[PDB]
Design a protein around this ligand. Structure first.
Ligand code: SF4
Ligand code: SF4
Ligand code: SF4
Ligand code: SF4
Ligand code: SF4
Ligand code: FES
Lengths: 127, 196, 127, 120, 756, 161, 384
């Protein structure tokens, strides 16, 4: 597993992600959005784990309306997953306290935890 | 009467016999003799195959011979041709690094779905099966959910102002290998049984 | 008998006296404990005049120089006692009907109590 | 006691001058997530003081998730209504009528006023 | 080993075994109140009662398994109808006078009484008979309730079951009888005539109490035992790195407790460690600030990285200072080290860096200090390395590490007798004042600051010391296997430290070196010390700097660009700093530390509310970009790879690292900074008054500088201006002023003045 | 034209819809059987379609398994447009008493929820309360706790896509 | 034509997915696909107290829930060796059979609707409503009632339950007959159901079809009879049977079962006298609520019981029970912890389904619907 990005910094993270995906076709990939708090999307923060199936990618919590210009970044993220033909979007709910510890765990463990907790989600809510 | 003929047979061939005074009885056959012996079991007059119950003993306080163990429930229906009402468990231990076991599909078509379930939830593959397809867990689910090393997968329960509960950090109840909240546990909390 | 009731009423009485000596000298009074048979009384009925089981007079430092208590509504051989901390001093109040509140055969008047409390404060109270 | 883990209680110390409960301790927060809640009443059954006791209201359907996590001050015996009910009854100024009637209220609910039977 | 059989099973077990421990070692169990790990069993609560045979020949009356020795070929019965009946009985006697507080009790889910009662209690009498819980239908004992004993400790006299655990503890382990029973019979109760609860170790009794009589006030009425998320970690407040457990629920630190780890801290924590948690979850900085209009502004991490590229665009790589925390992780120390290798710079240092590296000396293990023949002490153990006080309390009573059972540490160590006699001849202590421990030191001397060096010289034998110092010399001579313990004055002055190094080298003798920095020896071991040019942590040398703490103001003054990575917000920074950033406490960190004994310890992260805080690993990684260098470490795991390549051992492994280099610094004697337990950043809440600064002077010289016994005096140090209550002490050398060094600035001698 | 832009006309159509609210039930667990009670007592609702095509109101009644989510997704998408979603019971609304690998911990993940209805199962009359809610919700007669008036159709608010 | 009958549509009942391999109007083979309701109790319950689990037990077969309640309660009581009071046992047979009448009422309501027409769902619903009102009266809940306890049952029956059980016990004989009246003399249904749905006993046995859809093909096996538990051993008890297993016979058998159930209700109702209601062993049963204001031991045990709960011996256990869907039982592995080490639930509805590719093989398509309703599945039991 690769880890790119840094916590709480939306535009740098988006530019880096755009760099890293490339001409990879995503039709068999699974997209996991890691967040705390089910109800309130307005003050939400978002981290992302992408399981391509041939390799995995982690981004910390740099996304969402929680940070300035963050909403537009999450929206373009999901739009971009959608363009490469990613379809299967999932939402994972962690304790705020977890979020820092979760991404400091080793790749395999973090990934199994994420797939265990993740809820199938409409890509449209992040647009 | 058909049960006696099973136990008497197991004692001679060196098969260990488990008994709880609740009225439940087991017979553990080795891996080798399993397929054939059990073929003989249906042949022995065993109409009905009730269960295939998979067990993951990873987190069980005492050790057992191998990590996973499967229990079949064989019976002869009491209202049929000549039914005893003889019902009993046959247990077969299975290696962690070798989740193999012959199906009794040929024998009972009961063996069909149940062995598939035990494949889905635990990694155990059943030989000679018509179709081992994943049964229960979502198509794109990765792994085998009910085996102990696999997360129950809880999500925090949610309240008002930054307030959360993490169930696994909330739990008052202790498991078998749990210490408890004092220096140790003795007595009833190391296990208890009333005496009728 | 129903002497019980007059006892609880008299207990309320003694509490009143403690509160007074407290304000008078500018020295702390404290309500120590309420009745389990009130707290943990749920729907169950409660007729007692107060819900209060234990009280004390503390000095500046909060260490008590005088202690006072009554039996729960449900206990055998009901008494109200007084204890002087550190001094090994124990007193038992009964109630004889028509006479009043007595320690054995000696009447327990408010005055007697105030004197006992002052001796207590001056001797025992640290600040 | 809660199998759904739907009850959050932040605890607190009674003020001698002006008390809340009968011990030295009371409930600073009581939240219940109705959406998390399964409605066993293991909470009531666990409750030592007969504090928490399930009621009679069912008209609690509401539009927003977080409006559905009830607090202490929505649950006390004096209160008549559910959240959307009461909110409609303020935005209308037309009083609450619950859509239920009972023969009587349990001993454990004592103080809870309800429309009953022909007792009224 | 002595052959014992408990119930259905047989055990090997060393001769001096407590029957209780042979019981538990066989994997059985038996009620336990008065006896405690590391405490004298005295069959007191009489819970542990079992049966013993010696041939089938049963003894007439029951043995308290806690206070019974084991004999060769002995039998022990714990499940008999008669035993279980007796156990139930003692339990009923204990429950007899108790208060009825479970729902409302802070002892909540984990009460030795609750659990023992539910384990062994109500024996089965012989159906669905309707049975009675309670026989006794009379009035209970009612006494004083909810009584604060100290800003940190609360007392319920009703709950107390009169095991001896707290009083026993106070006399045996810390050695301060500030607690004992009062009257007798059933009237007996806990009280004190020493009101403060004076000891700096007082909070452990909260852990020991099998019931809720003694509870932790800083964490009173917060959450129930089960309800906390409990984060096992290690305490970074000083170099001994006790195991702790940081209870947090909903982002906030509720309560710190002791985590037992018999190699180093045993079952005990110090008051500053445990109650000094008030500040970590309390008032803390959650976003990056930038200087815009002569002042600070709340900003994105992005905008501040722009600011950061900007401020370093014009900067050459040897002008940058790199400065870490006394508690900085091995990963942070190592990555800072590797980045300053890459970016050629002469000055990188850490907050409690001592003129002489603690690496000079061979690390000593704690149990080595148990086995040693003599202990030579210069510096104050109580204040500099606090639980060392307690291990020296083990040392003095001749106690030595127990045989290790299947339930681990013995429950009743037959080896600890109650009320033990103490040797004064086993050690020599030399302190700048009459140290607390001077009670137990026959050879003991109050010296003054920077006088260590001359005691050490005397020990080497190049001159003749006082009566005391010649006695000390001679005892260390005759000492076959002594340990030398050295403080700040030793370690903060090159020559003293070298003489120590020398003496302790000549006789093959290990050292326990008390650094004002917690992670000092490891940060040293990751190669974080100043270089040739030599701007040190307190020196205004660099032109551009990164700071992980708050420096002397004389250091900040002058600099071109300054970037601080803190947890709370300092006033000293909003007038001197160009960029501020959020950091996690050690409570919420993840990474490694090195003990003053050379052991590597884990910090797990606590779910405290960090806000948008980030570990220094990430910050350094990000600060390297604006400078051109690409860093070798980003995250914890890769940092682990590089650490492991660097050959730092598994956790609980010892790291061996010596060093032979000194950086001396002159020390300007007017004021001394007394090394203190309580840390400056800890004075919040109830720790408010306890972490107060003090100024001590001999009443004569006090009188000269006009300093009254209760007064809050203003003081200026190069380390900043601190108010301090004035305490008169006749064991303090005349002509000096001891100011509480509530930081890792301890043991430094400084200019300054009492401002009026 | 979505029921909009004449004060007379939109109100008229909006009643039309609210009182017409045409439930398309999507049964899952025991909650579905608790809605089959609702079928009895019912009086703007309980004619179906049943076929999704023909209905405005989608009733999610029961635990929605994770494997089941993409299905319900298309059923919702495969509804005509002026459409509403009621979420019935704890399992649906939040994760319920089953907090785990198996089950969606809020149905609002996959389909835009209009109204939520707590209970395990909720009494049927509560679901009447919810359709009266949703009745009066599409009348634009509905408010949350913050003071805000609520939109007739949620999933007029999600980005489709 | 491999026709794809979807998950929830079109009226393939209870969220099943069916790949009817079918050319024409017959049925070649249906390749069944399940798992859409999988909640994962067997894992979840490893994380709940034995008490806590009693809230999760009714929730699988939600029609006959109390059979879950009964099976689990029993297997634990056995495992920890608890003694259930006679009046509790009687009430448990009453509730079990009443919940059975509820379940059955539902089964035939849906069946008659499924192919054939609408009307009789309503009368069955009326009687079911009287039953649910009974349950609400006693447990405060419609279903998923948290009532049964490892000792016994949560509390006693109120004054008003007895009178109301009689009312329904009065109308039901006439009532059950009215449903029967329409059916037994089946107008179209006869030419609709008599031929369809083939069940050989030998294959029922080979594929393991236990659940009362077994006796409709002429094998005589009832758990209340074959392996008696709760004192069914002591009742006047008729077990209805079928001739050759079709749709029709299954369908009537359960209707007979309803009057016999009602006869068990009346019978048990006769034998009921005042007493206590759960096993007083405090290890097993939380203290009386009244003395929480007096006894130390009470409070300790209350607190402990409702937090940690209790620890049964290390052991495995299982007991068989009869639901309206067949053999049900809990296989409980306890490790001596406060929560079960593992609970595997023997799901009758799960084994019963191996015989549908068999059952509807060669049948009609309109009938392929009816032949499903006739097998009476409940998916909560299946997926689980
Ligand atoms: S009824 Fe009580 S115990 Fe049960 S889920 Fe609701 S809050 Fe929890
Ligand atoms: S000390 Fe223990 S037994 Fe007593 S009230 Fe507290 S928790 Fe209960
Ligand atoms: S206060 Fe606690 S530790 Fe001290 S004697 Fe009493 S019960 Fe034992
Ligand atoms: S002795 Fe040192 S390491 Fe231990 S708790 Fe106290 S400050 Fe922390
Ligand atoms: S909320 Fe309750 S009634 Fe509804 S599906 Fe979930 S378990 Fe069943
Ligand atoms: S007597 Fe207290 S444990 Fe031995």
């Amino acid at each position: 597993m690769v880890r790119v990005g840094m916590r709480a910094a939306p535009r740098v993270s988006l530019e880096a992600l755009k760099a890293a995906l490339g001409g990879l076709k995503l039709s068999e990939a699974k997209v996991y959005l890691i967040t705390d708090w089910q109800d309130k999307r307005d003050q939400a923060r978002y981290a992302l784990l992408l399981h391509t199936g041939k390799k995995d990618l982690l981004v910390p919590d740099a996304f969402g309306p929680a940070f300035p210009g963050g909403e537009e970044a999450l929206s373009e993220l999901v739009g971009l997953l959608l363009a490469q033909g990613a379809r299967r979007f999932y939402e994972a709910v962690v304790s705020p306290g977890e979020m820092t510890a979760l991404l400091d765990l080793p790749p395999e463990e973090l990934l199994k935890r994420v797939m265990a907790i993740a809820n199938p989600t409409d890509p449209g809510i992040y647009l | 009467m058909r049960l006696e003929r099973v136990l008497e047979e197991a004692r001679a061939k060196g098969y260990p016999i488990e008994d709880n005074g609740l009225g439940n009885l087991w017979v553990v056959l080795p891996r080798e003799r399993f397929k054939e012996e059990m073929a003989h079991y249906k042949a022995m007059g065993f109409n009905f195959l009730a269960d295939i119950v998979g067990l993951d003993y990873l987190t069980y306080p005492d050790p057992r011979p191998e990590r996973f163990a499967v229990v079949y429930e064989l019976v002869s229906l009491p209202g049929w041709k000549d039914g005893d009402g003889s019902r009993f468990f046959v247990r077969v231990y299975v290696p962690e690094e070798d989740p193999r076991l012959p199906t009794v599909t040929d024998l009972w078509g009961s063996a069909n779905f149940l062995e598939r379930e035990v494949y889905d939830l635990f990694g155990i593959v059943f030989e000679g099966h018509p179709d081992l397809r994943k049964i229960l867990t979502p198509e794109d689910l990765e792994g085998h959910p009910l085996r102990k090393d696999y997360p129950l997968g809880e999500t925090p329960t949610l309240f008002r102002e930054g307030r959360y509960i993490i169930p696994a950090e909330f739990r008052a109840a202790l498991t078998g290998k749990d210490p408890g909240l004092t220096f140790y546990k003795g007595g009833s909390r190391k296990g208890y049984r009333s005496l009728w | 008998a129903s002497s019980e009731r007059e006892l609880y009423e008299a207990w309320v009485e003694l509490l009143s006296w403690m509160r007074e000596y407290a304000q008078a000298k500018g020295v702390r009074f404290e309500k120590e404990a309420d009745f389990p048979d009130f707290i943990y009384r749920m729907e169950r009925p409660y007729d007692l005049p107060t819900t209060i089981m234990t009280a004390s007079l503390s000095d500046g430092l909060g260490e008590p120089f005088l202690l006072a208590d009554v039996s729960p509504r449900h206990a055998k051989l009901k008494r109200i006692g007084l204890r002087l901390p550190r001094a090994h001093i124990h007193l038992h109040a009964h109630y004889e009907p028509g006479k009043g509140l007595v320690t054995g055969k000696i009447p327990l008047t408010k005055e007697r109590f105030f004197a006992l409390a002052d001796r207590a404060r001056e001797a025992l109270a640290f600040a | 006691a809660c199998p759904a883990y739907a009850i959050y209680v932040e605890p607190a110390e009674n003020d001698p001058e002006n008390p809340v409960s009968a011990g030295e301790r009371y409930a600073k927060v009581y939240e219940i997530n109705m959406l998390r809640c399964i409605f066993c009443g293991l909470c009531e059954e666990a409750c030592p003081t007969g504090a928490i006791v399930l009621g009679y209201d069912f008209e609690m359907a509401d539009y927003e998730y977080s409006d559905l996590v009830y607090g202490k001050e929505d649950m006390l015996v004096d209160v008549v209504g559910t959240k959307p009910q009461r909110r409609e009854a303020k935005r209308t100024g037309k009083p609450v009528k619950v859509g239920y009637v009972v023969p009587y209220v349990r001993p454990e609910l004592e103080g809870f006023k309800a429309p009953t039977e022909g007792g009224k | 080993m002595v052959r014992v059989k408990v119930n259905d099973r047989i055990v090997e077990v060393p001769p001096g075994t407590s029957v209780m421990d042979a019981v538990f070692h066989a994997g059985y169990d038996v009620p336990l109140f008065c006896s405690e790990k590391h405490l004298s069993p005295i069959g007191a609560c009489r819970m542990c009662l079992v049966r013993i045979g010696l041939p089938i020949q049963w003894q007439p009356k029951l043995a308290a398994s806690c206070v019974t020795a084991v004999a060769d070929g002995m039998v022990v019965d714990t499940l008999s109808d008669v035993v279980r009946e007796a156990q139930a009985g003692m339990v009923e006697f204990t429950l007899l006078n108790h208060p009825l507080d479970c729902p409302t009790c802070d002892k909540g889910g984990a009460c030795e009484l609750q659990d023992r009662t539910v384990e062994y209690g109500l024996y089965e009498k012989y159906p669905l008979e309707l049975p009675v819980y309670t026989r006794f239908e009379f009035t209970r004992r009612h006494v004083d309730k909810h009584h604060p004993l100290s800003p940190f400790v609360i007392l319920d006299r009703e709950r107390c079951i009169h095991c001896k655990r707290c009083v026993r503890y106070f006399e045996e382990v810390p050695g301060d009888e500030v607690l004992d029973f009062i009257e007798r019979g059933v009237h007996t109760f806990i009280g004190t005539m020493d009101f403060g609860l004076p000891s700096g170790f007082s909070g452990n009794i909260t852990d020991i109490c099998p019931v809720g009589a003694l509870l932790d006030l800083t964490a009173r009425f917060r959450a129930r035992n089960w309800e906390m998320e409990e984060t096992p970690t290690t305490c970074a407040l000083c170099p001994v790195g006790c195991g702790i457990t940081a209870d947090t629920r909903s982002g906030e630190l509720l309560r710190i407790r002791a985590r037992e780890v018999p190699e180093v801290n045993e079952i005990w924590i110090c008051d500053a460690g445990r109650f000094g948690h008030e500040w970590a979850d309390q008032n803390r900085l959650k976003t990056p600030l930038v200087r815009k209009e002569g002042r600070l502004v709340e900003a994105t991490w992005e905008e501040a990285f722009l600011a950061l590229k900007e401020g370093l665009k014009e900067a050459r790589g040897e002008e940058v200072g790199l400065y870490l925390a006394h508690d900085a992780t091995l990963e942070e120390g190592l990555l800072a080290s590797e980045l300053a290798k890459a970016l050629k710079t002469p000055h990188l240092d850490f907050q409690g860096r001592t003129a002489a590296p603690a690496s000079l000396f061979p690390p000593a293990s704690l149990e080595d200090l148990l086995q040693a023949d003599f202990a030579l002490v210069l510096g104050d153990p109580t204040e500099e390395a606090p639980i060392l006080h307690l291990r020296l309390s083990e040392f003095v009573r001749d106690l030595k590490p127990p045989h290790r059972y299947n339930h681990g540490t013995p429950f009743a160590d037959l080896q600890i007798k109650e009320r033990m006699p103490r040797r004064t001849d086993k050690m020599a202590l030399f302190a700048p004042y009459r140290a607390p421990l001077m009670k137990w030191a026959a050879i003991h001397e109050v010296h003054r600051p920077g006088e260590e060096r001359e005691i050490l010289l005397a020990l080497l034998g190049d001159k003749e010391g006082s009566e005391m110092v010649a006695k000390a010399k001679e005892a260390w001579e005759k000492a076959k296997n002594p340990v030398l313990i050295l403080g700040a004055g030793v370690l903060q002055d090159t020559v003293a430290a070298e003489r120590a190094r020398l003496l302790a080298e000549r006789k093959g003798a290990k050292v326990l070196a008390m650094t004002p920095a917690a992670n000092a020896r490891g940060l040293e071991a990751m190669g974080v010390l100043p270089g040739a040019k030599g701007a040190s942590w307190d020196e205004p040398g660099a032109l551009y700097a990164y700071y992980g703490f708050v420096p002397p103001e004389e250091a900040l003054k002058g600099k071109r660009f300054v970037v601080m990575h803190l947890s709370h917000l300092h006033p000293l920074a909003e007038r001197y700093a160009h960029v501020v950033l959020p950091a996690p406490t050690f409570y919420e960190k993840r990474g490694h530390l090195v003990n003053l004994e050379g052991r590597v310890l884990p910090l797990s992260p606590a779910p405290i509310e960090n806000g948008e805080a980030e570990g220094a690993l990430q910050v350094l990684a990000l600060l390297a970009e604006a400078l051109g260098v690409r860093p070798p470490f980003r995250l914890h795991l890769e940092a682990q790879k590089a650490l492991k390549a660097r050959k730092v051992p598994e956790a609980m492994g010892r790291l061996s690292f010596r060093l032979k280099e000194l950086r001396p610094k002159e020390r300007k004697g007017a004021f001394y900074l007394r090394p203190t337990m309580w840390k400056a950043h800890q004075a919040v809440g109830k720790a408010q008054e306890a972490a107060r600064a003090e100024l001590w002077a001999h009443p004569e010289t006090a009188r000269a500088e006009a300093l009254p016994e209760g007064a809050q005096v203003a003081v200026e140090t190069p380390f900043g201006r601190v108010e301090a209550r004035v305490v008169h002490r006749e064991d303090v050398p005349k002509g000096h002023l001891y100011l509480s060094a509530l930081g890792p600035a301890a043991g430094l001698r400084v200019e300054g003045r009492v401002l009026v | 034209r979505e029921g909009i832009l004449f004060t007379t006309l939109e109100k008229l159509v909006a009643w039309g819809r609210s009182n017409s609210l045409w439930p398309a039930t999507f049964g899952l667990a025991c909650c579905a059987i608790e809605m089959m009670a609702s079928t009895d007592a019912r009086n703007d609702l309980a004619r179906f379609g049943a076929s999704p095509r023909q209905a405005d109101v989608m009733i999610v009644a029961g635990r929605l398994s994770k494997k089941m989510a993409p299905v319900m997704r298309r059923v919702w998408e495969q509804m005509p447009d002026p459409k509403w979603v009621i979420s019935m019971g704890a399992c649906a609304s939040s994760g319920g008493m089953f907090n785990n690998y198996a089950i969606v911990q809020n149905v609002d993940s996959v389909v835009p929820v209009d109204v939520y209805v707590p209970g395990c199962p909720p009494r049927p009359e509560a679901l009447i309360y919810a359709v009266m809610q949703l009745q009066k919700k599409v009348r634009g007669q509905a408010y949350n706790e913050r003071g805000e008036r609520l939109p007739p159709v949620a999933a007029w608010k999600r980005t489709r896509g | 034509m491999t026709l794809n009958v979807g998950p929830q549509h079109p009226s393939t009942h209870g969220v099943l997915r069916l790949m009817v391999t079918l050319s024409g109007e017959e049925v070649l083979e249906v390749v069944p696909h399940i798992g859409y309701l999988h909640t994962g109790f067997e894992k979840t319950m490893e994380h709940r107290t034995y008490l806590q689990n009693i809230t999760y037990t009714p929730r699988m077969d939600y029609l006959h829930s109390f059979a879950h309640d009964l099976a689990y309660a029993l297997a634990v009581e056995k495992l920890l060796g608890a003694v259930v009071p006679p009046r509790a046992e009687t009430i448990r047979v009453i509730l079990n059979e009443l919940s059975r009448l509820a379940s059955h009422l539902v089964f035939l309501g849906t069946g008659l609707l499924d192919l054939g027409a609408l009307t009789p769902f309503f009368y069955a619903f009326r009687e079911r409503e009287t039953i649910l009102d009974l349950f609400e009266w006693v447990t405060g809940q419609r279903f998923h009632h948290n009532y049964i306890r490892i000792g016994g049952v949560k509390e006693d029956l109120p004054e008003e339950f007895v009178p109301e059980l009689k009312k329904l016990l009065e109308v039901l004989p006439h009532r059950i007959d009215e449903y029967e009246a329409l059916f037994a003399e089946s107008p179209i249904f006869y030419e609709r159901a008599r031929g369809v749905g083939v069940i050989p006993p030998e294959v029922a046995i080979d594929l393991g079809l236990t659940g009362g859809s077994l006796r409709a093909s002429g094998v005589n096996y009832d758990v209340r009879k074959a392996y008696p538990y709760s004192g069914y051993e002591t009742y006047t008890f008729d077990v209805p049977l079928g001739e050759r297993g079709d749709v029709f016979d299954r369908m009537l058998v359960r209707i007979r079962e309803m009057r016999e159930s009602v006869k068990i209700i009346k019978q048990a109702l006769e034998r009921l006298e005042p007493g206590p209601v759960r096993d007083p062993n405090p290890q097993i049963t939380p203290p009386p609520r009244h003395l929480l204001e007096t006894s130390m031991e009470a409070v300790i045990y209350h607190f402990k019981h409702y937090t940690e709960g209790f620890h049964p011996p290390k052991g495995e256990v299982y007991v068989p029970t009869e639901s309206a869907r067949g053999e049900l039982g809990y296989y409980i592995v306890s490790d001596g912890g406060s929560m079960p080490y593992r609970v595997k639930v023997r799901a009758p509805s799960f084994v019963n389904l191996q015989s549908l590719p068999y059952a509807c093989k060669g049948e009609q398509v309109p009938d392929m619907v009816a032949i499903i309703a006739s097998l009476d599945p409940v998916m909560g039991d299946v997926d689980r």
